[model samples]
Target: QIDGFVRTLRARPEAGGKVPVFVFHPAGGSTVVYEPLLGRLPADTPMYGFERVEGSIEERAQQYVPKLIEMQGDGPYVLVGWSLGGVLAYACAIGLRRLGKDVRFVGLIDAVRAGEEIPQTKEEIRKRWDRYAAFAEKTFNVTIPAIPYEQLEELDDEGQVRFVLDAVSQSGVQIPAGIIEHQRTSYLDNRAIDTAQIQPYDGHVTLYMADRYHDDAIMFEPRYAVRQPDGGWGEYVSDLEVVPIGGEHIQAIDEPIIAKVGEHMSRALGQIEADRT
Candidate 1:
C-alpha cells in the first residue's frame, strides 16, 4: 500500500543516484502547486511531495522524517517546500540531521519564518487574514461573505467564527459548523507556533523569494506576503541564499516563473552532486 501523504510526483529511475527531491505541501494545499516545475526541471529529476499535515509544526515535521527515510534510505537528501510547507521542511531537515542523516539541500519557496524584528503593519496583517479566509473558501468549497477587515475585527473570536458559519449557510452551502470551528482553531494554533522563536539550524537554505510581495502588496497573495525580503528566515537560518523569483505569490508557482525556480534547483543540485564524489 502507498502512503497517503507521500506522493511520488515524478518517477525517473534513469536519474539514478540523484537524491530524490521531496517537497512539502503549502498550508492547507497540495503538491499540485509544484506541478508546473516538473517539465522545466531536468528531465531525469525525480520529485516527491507530502500532502497537507496537521498538528504542531514539530509534530508534523516528525511525521515526515520517518516517511522520508522509509521512501529513500540514508544520506544526501534534498528537501523543498513552499509556504507552510517551507516551515515544515526546515523542521524536517533539523530532525533528519539530528539523526545524522545528510541533508544535501533545503530550498524554501517564499516561506516565511518567525523572529523578525519588524512586525507586519496592522494593514498587512488584516489583508493577510482576508487572504486566509479566501483560501478557506476555495479549499473547503464554502462561500464566505465579503466582509471587510474592520468589521470582522470588531467581533470576538467566537463571534467571528459564527459570522463565517452564518455567511456560508446563508449562501446556500451547507457547511458543518465543526468544520469552520476546526479551521479557525487550527489556524490559530498553527499561527501561534509560527510566532514563537525558532531554534537555529546549522544548514544552508536557499530562499526562493517572490519578487512582487515587497513592491506591490495588492498584486501578491496576502497569505504569503512578508515585509522582510528574506521571508524572515535570515535570523533562524545562519547560512542562507536568497534568489528572487520573478512573480507574485500565485504567479511564482506557475510557469515562466517556474522556469527560474526549476533552473535554480537544477543548478544547485548539479553543484551538490559534483561535490559528492
Candidate 2:
C-alpha cells in the first residue's frame, strides 16, 4: 500500500469562490481538462479537481467522497466532471446520496458513459492517434505527426503536441506541469482500461454534450458511444438533464465556449445556497 493523500487543483483566487465544487479527471487522469472553464466559474466558488484515478469507478467513488466530505463537509456539494471524471463524479454522488447526503448539483461536461476511451487493438490505437494528428491539423492549423508511443517517448514535450493536443502535450502547451507526464502516460498506457464496456450509473445526471460530431479519428470514443443529437443520453442515465454547449467536447473547454459552461455552473452554484438556507 502507498502512504499518501490526493492533492486537489484549485480554481483561481485559490478556493476563492461560492459553493465548494469537486471536479474529476478525464480519461487522461488529469483535471487540467477543466482549465478552460475554471476561469469562468463564479469567483466565490471553490473547485477541487483530483489526480488520475487508477481503480474501478466504485473504488474511485469510495476513495473520493470521504475526502470531499472531509474537505467540504457533509450535506449538498456540487459534483462536476468531464469524460471519465464525469463517470467517477456521478458514481461518487450516488455513493454520497446513498449515505443520505444531498448533492446540490451534478455537472457532466461531454462525459461518455456508454463506450470505451480507446479501441480494442493496438493497431486501432495507432490509427486513433493518426486521427488525432489530423484533428490537430484541422483545429489548430498545425501539423502533428502520428508518432507511436516509442517514437513519442523519444520526443520532448515541445513536440509531443507534435506542439501536444493537451487534454486533447508536453513536448508543451501552457497547462499544468504534472499534466504533461500524465497525458503521455495515459495516452500510451491507460488504453487497457478503455475496454468496450459501457458502465452503468443511475440517478439524475446533469449531462452536457458538445454540439458537434465525435468521430473515432478526432476523439477516443467508439461509434456506438458518441452522444447523438437525438436523446442518446436517455439510454444511459435514468434521469438526464442535458445542457448543449458550443464546440465538441474538446473545443467546449476553450474560451468563449467555456463561458457557456461557466454560465450553467454559476446557476448550479446557487443550489448550495438554496440548500443551506
Candidate 3:
C-alpha cells in the first residue's frame, strides 16, 4: 500500500550513508511531475517522491503518512514539499519527531502555511471558485472543449496553455469527479487526526516562496518577489529560513530553477553536517 504512494530516486552511496530527501507534490499533482528531477541532485542524496492520495492519482496517498514514517525510520533526511506537499511534509516532520526519529529539515516550496485564511463559507468558496474559474479560463483559454487529465502531460507548451485556459475557466473543471470523491473522504480522515498529534517537531524549517502569483511574475523577478511580513508565516517556527526562488509554482520543473534549488539543498545539507560535527 505504501509503495504505491511513493516514487524514489536511487542514488549512489556516500561514505557514512545516503542522505534522504522526500519530495511532496501539490494538489492536483502526482509523483510523475517530479520526473525531471531524477539524477539532478548530489549522487549520495536519495530522493523520494510522495504522491497525495486524495489529489490526482490515488485515494490512499493521504492516509499513508504513518506508513511512510515507519518505513523511513530514524534516518538523516530532509522533507521537501511543493504547495500542498509542503503542508504534508511539515505534518510528517511532526509525526517522525513523535516516534523519536531525526528529521534534519522540513522545506516548504512555494506553499501556504496552516493559518492562512482561505475561503471557508460555501458562499465564499463559490465566489472564489468563480473568480479562479474566470482566471483559469482567461489564463488557459477555455473556448475549446475540456481535455482529459491523462492527455495533459502529452501536450506541448502550446497545448498545455490551451488546456489550462479552458479548464480553469470554470472552478478548475470541477476538480475531476474522481478526485472530488477522494478528497471528500480524505478530508474527513484528515480531520480525525488531531493537530496536537502533528505538533512538537522542531526540525529546521525553510519556506521557498515563488516571487509572483501569475505565471510570468516570478520569471521577471525571482529574487525580489518573495514577500514575508515581519511576523508572517515564517514567524510560527524557530530556525526558519525564507528564500524566494525564480519561477512560478510549476516552473520549478524547468531547468536552472531546479538546478538552483538542488544547489541550495546541497549547500544546506553541508551546513547541517557541519553543525553536527
**By TM-score, how accurate is candidate 2?**
0.63
lDDT of 2 by residue, 7-98 (tens): 44553354424666778776554666676677787665666786664455577677888887876666566888776677677777877877
lDDT of each: 0.71, 0.62, 0.57
For candidate 1, what is the total of clashing residue pairs? 0
Query: Which model scores highest in TM-score?
Result: 1
Residue lDDT tens for model 3, 172-251:
34557575545444433332221213344466887776554454433322322444442144445767777767667667
TM-score of each: 0.72, 0.63, 0.63
What lDDT, from 0 to 1, does candidate 3 have?
Answer: 0.57
Q: Which of the two candidates, 1 or 2, achieves a greater TM-score against the reference?
A: 1
TM-score of structure candidate 1: 0.72
lDDT (Cα, tens digit) per residue for candidate 1, span 1-277: 1368887788647545666788887654678778887777776678888876656678787788999898777868888987667777888998898888989899888765432332435565566567767877897998876657776666544445556656657866677867775666545433534443466778899888776444333323434344576677777788989998866755766788878889999898888778977
Q: Which residue runs of candidate 2 sit more than 4 Å off their true CA positions? A: 1-17, 113-203, 213-221, 224-226, 229-232
Model 2 — which ten-residue stretch has the worst lDDT?
A: 188-197
> Cα deviation of 175 in candidate 1 (Å)?
3.7
